Design a protein around this ligand. Structure first.
Ligand SMILES: Cn1cnc2ccc(-c3ccnc(NC[C@H](O)CN4CCc5ccccc5C4)c3)cc21
Ligand SMILES: Cn1cnc2ccc(-c3ccnc(NC[C@H](O)CN4CCc5ccccc5C4)c3)cc21
Ligand SMILES: Nc1ncnc2c1ncn2[C@@H]1O[C@H](C[C@@H](N)CC[C@H](N)C(=O)O)[C@@H](O)[C@H]1O
Ligand SMILES: Nc1ncnc2c1ncn2[C@@H]1O[C@H](C[C@@H](N)CC[C@H](N)C(=O)O)[C@@H](O)[C@H]1O
Ligand SMILES: Nc1ncnc2c1ncn2[C@@H]1O[C@H](C[C@@H](N)CC[C@H](N)C(=O)O)[C@@H](O)[C@H]1O
Lengths: 303, 625, 625, 322
């Protein structure tokens, strides 16, 4: 049986669907992890490939390679779950209690051997996944860390953002690893991040007020911006196309899809609660899957 | 033993978690009452219509467990002071919702953070909650010694942490608490959960919190060090603060995960227990005072009222006051009658205000210690104690002691005294009219006669203390001036307070007083150099007295008579708190005033700003002649 | 176990005597504080200058012994109301002297007699004492059921005892207590030590003392009878009074010498213990109420406030209310769906104000008892209980129960009801706005739909009780009308009181109410025949309700639902007590009033005299819509 | 909750500017809604919401034979005592052109919809007589393209110094209530012995009609008043401005005050304790408008250069009855 609040949806390269969800109300506050080789069968538990209960809720997750699942837990743990040989069990590889508060965000760095986590405890941590240890611990921020995002191609570079209003570009090769970046004037709080998968120099960020903006790291200047949403922007997900489209999800319960100049191509009101994640099919590049706290798994068709 | 809770921000199952932490040793648990990640919408559809339940059920704990074991926590996404209107309105409504739920549940406390400068709207919402109905939870505001922004790693290349020290800046969080608490008009329901950091800030930043209503101190696991054998312990400097916090008596709260994997959570706890086991034991004074900290008493009306038998009982047990008197009487006897006169010379000794007789006995012990001879009068105005006295001189003293039932200002003495002995002293020395009483008695002391005490002096010190300011404010009564509480002094065992400058002498009286024209009125100006930032709430008074020569009594802290519990300090409030800054001078003015019927004090602060003149005319407070 | 003291008027040695009586079983001792025969002079010489001591010393007992074991007695020569001036002045001064001494000593009580009609000056002196300082003794006025003059042997030839009975005369001593207590302005510090005689007076003389503040009952040895084996016992009629006095809970006092020489003093005591061992055990109701007698509660603001979880908890334990509801729902189901329709017909049942769900469960039990089928809505305005409810319908009820979070006056119902079920009732029936609430809900009951309750009726009875009059008076607050306390009703477990006439119906409401024009305002006149003399202090309210057909709930004493503790009576005070005489009628008038925001009651007595109209405009008390 | 007295309507009916300003607004609106070719064919439905003794009904009538256009009038009034004056007006004078309606505008079931609603429900702080709540519950009977007159209003605040007024407030202590309540309610006062410390700044703004998807009349606002003298702060003078129609306005803001208009004095919002302000400091003040279903109130607090207590929390000392 599956808890109502769907937190995460990610396609594997082979087309199978990883699902994360928490119980955010009722007697038991926990979470679970699900694998759905039939993605159209989501989220019925009987018609799943694998599935397991976690100690506490899942605030975030990400695929590690092809069989690993890296989880941001309410408990302060970062955990790594391993997919079965058959891929019919999901087995705990490590549970490490290193954060002092809810771990809110997690991301795998380019070479698949390290990860960065972000916490309400205001810390950012760099993990050796093979070693199951915290390599580095950074208190750069002054309020809870909202999102960490690895660069596509460099193991020492990642974005982070906090309710302390700072967007930070990181580079563990420098003596002083973080460097504050963003728009001319300090605007609204940064709530979501995604690197451009082609131009490894550009990213987008979403704010608390529903604006999506495009940033050059080179210009240290905000290129374009658009008011996409009427509420906070919780996720930004680029399509796997040559010229990638950008999926935009929100607490206004809608999904939008925008082109590279950030114009609206599509919008979906299908959800009736917060939209928590988007994931593009590796197979059908026009098929896009969103999940939300309504416990709906919706497969969209994008022009 | 310490009282301590566990702070958690993750609770999968309530029954399990409560058990686990109770096993570990904790007295209570701080947890979310809604899931910390469960952002609710109150206005926009469809999110607003989210099917319930909105949280987990009250049935999961007994009514008693809720009332004694659980401290609520505001959900961390609730931001009433956000610059985004919609977030401001969901937060306003969600804060109400969570606060109403804690009240429904009967929770004894509830935590809310001050984690930024502007908390106006949080303050307004909470004030509004406080003034809605009849619920009982304390509110603990989670404030750090050091702001998060001033605590960060210096690891941002283009945003360095500012190196040059700012005396003010490092007190920024006291001002967070101060403004918040002012906004909410000093509600007795709002207290401090002070969060202690790995790096302590400077003394001065920490002292700042002296006299604030600290109900709990939050210790992250991360601030603990590791000893030889792997156990958690604290730095020397952290220990000093633990001791000050134990002395104050607060509840400790452990927060964060186990950073000593070798042992369980009870290890942190056992260190705190170790610390309190290891502090000094209560001295004799501290044991007497134990129940009385910041408890406010109306001072005795010494003349218009008669003390109760049990009041004489409690103070007769003073292990220092009477043996000090004996020693004064002893030294005086020798000085007045030479060895050759010893069996020829009989000293007339009068005890003025003899109570149940201890100073009469002390006199008697002084005579067969000096080996000299004395005739005793025991004068007492309280006819009820006169019963104890007259039963003493029949069964014991014999005709050596002449018991006299009357006022010393009234008595027609058969002969003159060599020595008058009295203890007519209150905590501000002369606040029981010892001057007026001994003045009207002195006509029967021989021209070369000694008074014991020979003199006394009162002292004043400015103080900070929100707690006491609030205890006074709460003393408002029906059918009198709504501000009278502030225009009278209180005998109080000052405990949760900060003394802002060293005590300075105020009024002085000498006995006998053969001033051609006797005047007991006084006017005095005091200038108190202050070297911290703070808020002034009143003046602690104390006193010193010269019994005889070098034999003294004192409640001035610097020269306090050890073991002597007979007097607590006195507190003289002011109607309105006054902000004082580093390096400023507090100027205060006291008058002693009288007419034929009564005596009173009037006071006013004149710098760094003026207060109203307090108690003009004895309008709120007089001492009856 | 009883709490009892010994009354003595002779104490040679205090330590001995205290011991002796403690041995015998007594909890405390009533004794002189000065020698009863020791007439003192305060004005004329030489008598005035009598060398002391004036009495024995406080040192003879511990402070604790004084506070817990000794009750003072006024010296019997003290006669403040004598017609001889000099005696009047020595008495005034000696009464002060003895009273000051009891206060000095910290005595918990002190006895003074009312042994004659005129006690004005005694009253004045005592009043003056009460308003001097801060002392704590109760004053117990020793009054007999029967005056000594009405008790004498008829053995004076030329002064016969008057044979013809006088209804009034035999109540002369109640009027002694009444005037005295009025003089002293009802001080909460003055209570009754009622002296029981060998011959009881008539019932009516004794009932007179119903609702007075009796703190002790004094039993002379002389009134006890002797049984077969020589032990002391009491007449059947005396036992009845002992039982009423135990029920009231007072302290017993044995007075006089041992008139059963065969045994010791503990024998009298052991009989009293025997008596209280032998009374009925507390029924379920009496056990719930145990801590609540004459304790005054502000009634719930049912709509503007949300009940706390522990409040639902306490009342969910009612062993009768819910099983009565179940039985009403049961009978209704059968009446609406025939056996042939049983599996075809699904009744729509709405619980309006569902709290934590007990009436939803009772509905469910009623359905598989009637063996019929139902669809349930659970409406609740209190979002905190809605949490309990929504956790119930996920874990248990399933889609058979639709939980609805809103006000019943607000809800847009998807379908119409066959049956609405509610318990929105306060102690005066409609004082929680059940009428207004069900009125605005009824538009969704089908044309042939049943409301449970179908109707309710409130009832009123006039009462006597100085104790409650004083509890109300003491409810004066700062910052509001100084008489508001009297212009609002109180939920109270009426205990020390006398009910003056039988309850009479007041307001009645029916549901549904398809009155063409609905009006919930009411005006009613009641005439209460009174057959005793007494003083009126207020009106006890009660109620009855028809759940379904013959299934009822009631807190009217005559028809009280057994075991049902969910409602205490309600009290409606009047500002000023009113004297009523044998055979008079008390007339009272109640109005129920409203506007769109609130509902309130206004009341006035119109006979035998008028009171002021109480609570005009809801100036002191409204019930928020 | 109260009904005005006859003499109160009398005094203000004598305002030499307020009504002729209304007439001019009604005039301009009529022309804008009905073209010359429609003039004799088009009859505008005009509703006066809160009609008092009829001056805005007459001003409407004068506006019609000034614009030379044709109108049907409703005169709604909740005060049954003024309704007596009104119904005696429409018998003796107005005739069936004016339909007098005795009820609350929030309550009335209107037979038809309005082209134009006309009202003056304004107090010295604009919205302090519940004009928003009143026009909100009335708007369902304004046609989709209907105009409200006023179209909008805005309140303004300025900090003030004045020991005299501080003392007048202090002296307002009453028996049987909070001894500090005097300070937690505003006063209509012709401010005279006082010093205004900074220029007035806009506070709350309301628009009519308000077809906000979700209507919310609550408000929270922060104002920063630059002060360039040394002084002591004792309270905030409030004022207001309103857009009747287009460029036709009323104002009691000193800088833009409507000349001759005496119908409103300023409002005063005290603080419990005076606050010392120094040359070059900023006074920061915060106002909230609050409500529930029964009442509306204001709560305020100073946050710089020091904080005051939050005033009037919960409407504990002062509410405006719905
Ligand atoms: C802690 N404590 C326990 N019982 C107390 C009774 C009175 C007081 C009390 C009340 C108001 N003022 C004072 N302090 C000033 C007095 O002058 C203290 N002296 C100390 C010596 C003394 C000796 C005999 C009789 C009375 C006294 C009182 C004490 C404190 C008590
Ligand atoms: C003896 N006791 C112990 N806890 C109490 C809480 C409230 C009250 C209380 C306070 C004011 N008025 C009342 N009585 C009138 C109420 O309508 C009684 N009903 C009885 C049934 C009921 C069921 C659920 C929730 C509340 C109630 C309240 C009781 C009494 C309590
Ligand atoms: N003017 C006065 N004349 C006579 N007795 C006084 C006067 N003023 C105060 N007293 C008594 O002086 C005593 C003062 C007490 N502080 C000392 C009691 C006793 N000497 C002792 O040390 O225990 C009280 O018993 C007062 O009643
Ligand atoms: N107008 C209303 N609409 C909805 N609920 C109401 C209304 N008035 C009162 N209530 C609720 O009705 C319940 C009344 C209680 N006396 C009964 C609780 C529950 N039925 C029980 O017997 O335990 C309370 O929980 C109120 O909050
Ligand atoms: N909700 C309401 N419904 C109907 N009348 C109202 C309402 N609120 C206020 N009023 C009336 O509106 C009038 C407002 C006055 N300021 C104006 C009087 C008149 N229009 C004039 O200018 O002289 C008063 O007569 C109020 O009684």
């Amino acid at each position: 049986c599956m808890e109502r609040q769907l937190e995460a949806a990610r396609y594997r390269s082979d087309g199978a669907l990883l699902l994360g969800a928490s119980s955010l109300s009722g007697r038991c506050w926990a979470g679970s992890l699900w694998l759905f080789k039939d993605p159209c069968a989501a989220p019925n538990e009987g018609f799943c490939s694998a599935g397991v209960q976690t100690e506490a809720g899942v605030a975030d997750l990400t695929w590690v390679g092809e069989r690993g699942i890296l989880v941001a837990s309410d408990s302060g743990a970062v955990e790594l779950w391993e997919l079965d040989e058959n891929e019919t069990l999901i087995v705990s590889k490590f549970c490490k209690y290193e954060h002092d508060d809810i771990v809110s965000t997690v991301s795998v760095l380019s070479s698949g051997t390290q990860a960065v986590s972000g916490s309400k405890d205001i810390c950012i941590k760099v993990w050796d996944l093979a070693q199951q240890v915290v390599l580095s611990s950074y208190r750069a921020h002054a309020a809870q860390v909202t999102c960490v995002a690895a660069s596509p191609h460099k193991d020492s570079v990642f974005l982070s953002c906090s309710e302390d209003n700072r967007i930070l570009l990181w580079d563990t090769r420098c003596p002083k690893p973080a460097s504050q970046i963003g728009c001319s004037a300090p605007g609204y709080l940064p709530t979501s991040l995604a690197w451009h998968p082609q131009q490894s120099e550009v990213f987008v960020f979403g704010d608390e007020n529903g604006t999506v903006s495009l940033v050059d790291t080179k210009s240290t200047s905000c290129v374009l911006s658009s008011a996409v949403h009427s509420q906070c922007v919780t996720g930004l997900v680029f399509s796997p196309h040559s010229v990638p489209f950008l999926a935009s999800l929100s607490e206004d319960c809608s999904l939008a899809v925008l082109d590279s100049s950030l114009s609206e191509l599509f919008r979906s009101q299908a959800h009736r609660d917060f939209v928590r994640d988007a994931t593009w099919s590796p197979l059908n590049h026009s098929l896009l899957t969103t999940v939300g706290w309504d416990h709906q798994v919706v497969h969209h068709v994008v022009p | 033993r310490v009282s301590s809770g566990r702070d958690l921000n993750c609770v999968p199952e309530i029954a399990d978690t409560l058990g686990a932490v109770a096993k570990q040793g904790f007295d209570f648990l701080c947890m979310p009452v809604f899931h910390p990640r469960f952002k609710r919408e109150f206005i926009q559809e469809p999110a607003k219509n989210r099917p319930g339940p909105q949280t987990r059920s009250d049935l999961l704990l007994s009514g008693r467990d809720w009332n004694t074991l659980i401290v609520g926590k505001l959900s961390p996404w609730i931001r009433p002071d956000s610059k985004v209107e919609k977030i401001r309105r969901n937060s306003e409504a969600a804060m109400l919702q969570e606060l109403n739920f804690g009240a429904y549940l009967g929770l004894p406390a509830f935590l809310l953070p001050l984690n930024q400068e502007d908390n106006t709207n949080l303050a307004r919402v909470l004030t509004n909650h406080i003034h809605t109905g009849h619920h009982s939870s304390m509110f603990w505001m989670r404030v750090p010694l050091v702001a998060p922004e001033d605590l960060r790693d210096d690891i941002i290349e283009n945003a360095p942490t500012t190196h040059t020290e700012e005396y003010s800046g490092e007190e920024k969080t006291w001002m967070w608490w101060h403004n918040f608490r002012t906004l909410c008009d000093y509600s007795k329901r709002i207290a401090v959960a002070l969060e202690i950091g790995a790096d302590l800030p400077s003394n001065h930043v920490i002292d700042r919190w002296l006299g604030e209503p600290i109900k709990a101190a939050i210790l992250p696991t991360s601030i603990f060090l590791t000893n030889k054998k792997g156990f958690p312990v604290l730095s020397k400097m952290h220990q000093r603060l633990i001791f000050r916090l134990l002395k104050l008596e607060v509840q400790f709260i452990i927060t964060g995960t186990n950073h000593h994997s070798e042992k369980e959570f009870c290890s942190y706890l056992q260190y705190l227990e170790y610390l309190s086991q290891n502090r000094p034991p209560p001295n004799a004074y501290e044991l007497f005072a134990k129940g009385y900290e910041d408890y406010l008493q109306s001072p005795l009306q010494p003349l218009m009222d008669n003390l109760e038998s049990q009041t004489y009982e409690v103070f007769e047990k003073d292990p220092i006051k009477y043996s000090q008197y004996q020693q004064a009487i002893y030294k005086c006897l020798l000085d007045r009658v030479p060895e050759e006169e010893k069996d020829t010379n009989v000293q007339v000794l009068m005890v003025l205000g003899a109570g149940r007789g201890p100073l009469v006995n002390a006199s008697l012990r002084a005579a067969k210690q000096a080996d000299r001879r004395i005739k005793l009068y025991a004068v007492e105005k309280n006819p009820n104690a006169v019963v104890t006295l007259e039963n003493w001189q029949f069964e014991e003293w014999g005709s050596q002691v002449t018991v006299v039932s009357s006022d010393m200002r009234e008595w027609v003495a058969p002969e003159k005294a060599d020595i008058i002995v009295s203890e007519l002293l209150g905590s501000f020395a002369d606040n029981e009219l010892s001057p007026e009483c001994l003045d009207g008695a002195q006509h029967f002391l021989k021209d070369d006669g000694v008074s014991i005490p020979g003199e006394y002096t009162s002292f004043l010190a400015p103080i900070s203390s929100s707690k006491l300011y609030n205890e006074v404010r709460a003393c408002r009564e029906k059918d009198r001036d709504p501000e009278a509480q502030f225009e009278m002094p209180y005998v109080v065992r000052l405990h949760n307070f900060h003394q802002l400058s060293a005590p300075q002498p105020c009024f002085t009286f000498s006995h006998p007083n053969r001033d051609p024209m006797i005047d007991n009125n006084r006017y005095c100006t005091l200038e108190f150099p202050v070297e911290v930032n703070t808020v002034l709430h009143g003046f602690a008074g104390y006193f010193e007295t010269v019994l005889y020569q070098d034999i003294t009594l004192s409640i001035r802290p610097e020269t306090h008579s050890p073991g002597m519990f007979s007097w607590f300090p006195i507190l003289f409030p002011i109607k309105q708190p006054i902000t004082v800054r580093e390096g400023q001078t507090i100027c205060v003015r006291f008058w002693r005033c009288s007419n034929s019927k009564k005596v009173w004090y009037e006071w006013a602060v004149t710098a760094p700003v003026c207060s109203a003149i307090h108690n003009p005319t004895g309008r709120s407070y007089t001492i009856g002649l």
